[PDB]
Amino acid sequence: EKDFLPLYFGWFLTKKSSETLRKAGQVFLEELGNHKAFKKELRHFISGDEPKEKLELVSYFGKRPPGVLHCTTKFCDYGKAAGAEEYAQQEVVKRSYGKAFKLSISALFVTPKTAGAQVVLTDQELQLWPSDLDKPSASEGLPPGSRAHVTLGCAADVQPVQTGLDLLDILQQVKGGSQGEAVGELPRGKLYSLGKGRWMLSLTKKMEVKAIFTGYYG
């Protein structure tokens, strides 16, 4: 018999770090939904603003991680995903399995589909980032590891994998220092309105979270 791989590999945040990031994300949703720039753009966010009332983003992102938060490196589907075996056989992956890492969170974001946190990997952590033969059209021209994120919430009919795609689309948009100017300032940083229902909070001070690199089997 052959050994199957994890569902996916990634960094799983400690209990304390997950709680700190989760709360920071929830506070962001509350502040954003209350901000006049967001309220004014609700039609670009939802088609159901027929009612001129307030959208509660915590409710909108009603599918959330139930427990510990994580940052996926390679989705393997037990070995069925393309590139899964190649990723898992790397020395660096086997050597790092079970080890602790610190991940830097540089931004929080919201789109009509997902709420998440942008992770900025170190050079060492980038060695654990996969390099496959399918660099999506979405990631082209962005540095390796740009997709690294923590999912904080998803709209009802959205899959968590969409969060990485949303982050890449946001990074394409702000690539050319194309942030322009902030539409406001929340307590933790500058708030950017990127159009098409996309919002990005750039943290004045990056958040550091501790996590264990390991395999999740579902």
DSSP lists the bridge partners of residue 189 as 186, 203
72 labeled part of a ligand binding site: yes
Residue from 10, 29, 70, 194 carrying the catalytic annotation: 70
**What is the end-to-end Cα distance of the chain in Å, rounded?**
21
Token couple for 36: 């006049």
Residue from 113, 147, 149, 198 carrying the catalytic annotation: 149
* Residue from 127, 119, 148, 124 nearest 206 by CA: 119
Reply yes or no on whether 44 is catalytic: no
- Asked if 182 and 15 count as a contact pair (C-beta separation under 8 A), the reply is no
- Asked if 29 and 113 count as a contact pair (C-beta separation under 8 A), the reply is no
20 labeled part of a ligand binding site: no
Give the Cα separation of 144 and 163 in Å (integer). 17
Provide the annotated active-site residues: 70, 149
**Which residues line the annotated binding site for substrate?**
72, 151
Annotated binding site: 72, 151
